[PDB]
């Protein structure tokens, strides 16, 4: 019982503390660690054995050594009822604790959904190889949704390539050696014209 029974309990508390960054959390970790050390403190003092016969013989008050023994033994029989406590702690505990039981459960479900997204993508990616070996309309079917977006660019007459793409990487590759190196402005439509004109005291609007 005494040795090796607290090793696992130290790894858990250590990680919980390492994850703590804000001072507020670190304080709660100190409180948590104290209670664990408080409950897990080991008691070893070599409980001495009482030889009532020895004291009874050397010297004692008549009826005292025997009265102490019978009363002493009666309390030694009493012991903790570990069973009752074992059940209550396992049945229900700290309805406030249920707050994070349901918070971390939903928090984990969010990031399990993301883990499945990345996992399933790498799974489907196994059958897709060598984009240069597929026809045009077949590649768009692997990447379902691009044809739909391509129709949106066409039906809105956004036929300037890369206008609605935040990083028109294809536009930078084509302009690596162009004169007046520039890429189309974001969301530029081939029909919009923001031109103005003014008349000043001078000519040419100057």
């Amino acid at each position: 019982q005494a040795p090796g029974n607290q090793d696992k309990i130290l790894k858990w508390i250590s990680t919980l503390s390492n994850k703590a960054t804000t001072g507020e959390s670190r304080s709660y970790c100190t409180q948590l660690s104290s209670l664990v050390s408080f409950y897990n403190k080991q008691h070893v003092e070599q409980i001495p054995t009482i030889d009532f016969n020895e004291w009874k013989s050397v010297i004692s008050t008549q009826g005292l050594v025997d009265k102490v023994k019978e009363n002493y033994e009666s309390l030694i029989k009493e012991q903790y009822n570990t069973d009752a406590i074992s059940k209550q702690i396992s049945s229900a505990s700290s309805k406030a604790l249920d707050d994070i039981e349901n918070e971390l459960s939903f928090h984990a479900a969010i990031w399990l959904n993301a883990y499945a997204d990345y996992t399933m993508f790498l799974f489907e990616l196994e059958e897709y190889n060598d984009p240069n070996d597929y026809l045009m309309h077949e590649n768009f079917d692997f990447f379902r949704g691009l044809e739909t977006e391509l129709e949106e660019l066409t039906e809105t007459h956004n036929y300037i390539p890369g206008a609605k793409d935040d990083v028109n990487l294809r536009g930078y590759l084509a302009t690596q050696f162009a004169w007046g190196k520039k890429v189309i402005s974001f969301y530029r439509h081939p029909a919009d014209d923001f031109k103005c004109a003014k008349a000043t005291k001078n000519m040419l609007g100057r």
Binding site: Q6, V36, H43, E45, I47, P48, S60, Q79, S86, I89
Partner: protein, 55 residues
């Protein structure tokens, strides 16, 4: 669950040591008074002898 089981366990021993320690101190403490009563009784005998000399 393991912290509660180890708490009641070690706490059970502490109570056990408390009782036996109490039962042992009360016994030793009583013996101390018993020896004092014996010394007081014999001291009176010596006191009686000294008074007899004075008389």
């Amino acid at each position: 669950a393991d912290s509660i089981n180890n708490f009641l366990a070690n706490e059970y021993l502490r109570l056990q040591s408390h009782i036996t320690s109490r039962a042992l101190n009360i016994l030793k403490q009583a013996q101390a008074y018993e020896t004092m009563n014996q010394a007081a009784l014999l001291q009176k005998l010596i006191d009686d002898a000294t008074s007899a000399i004075d008389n």
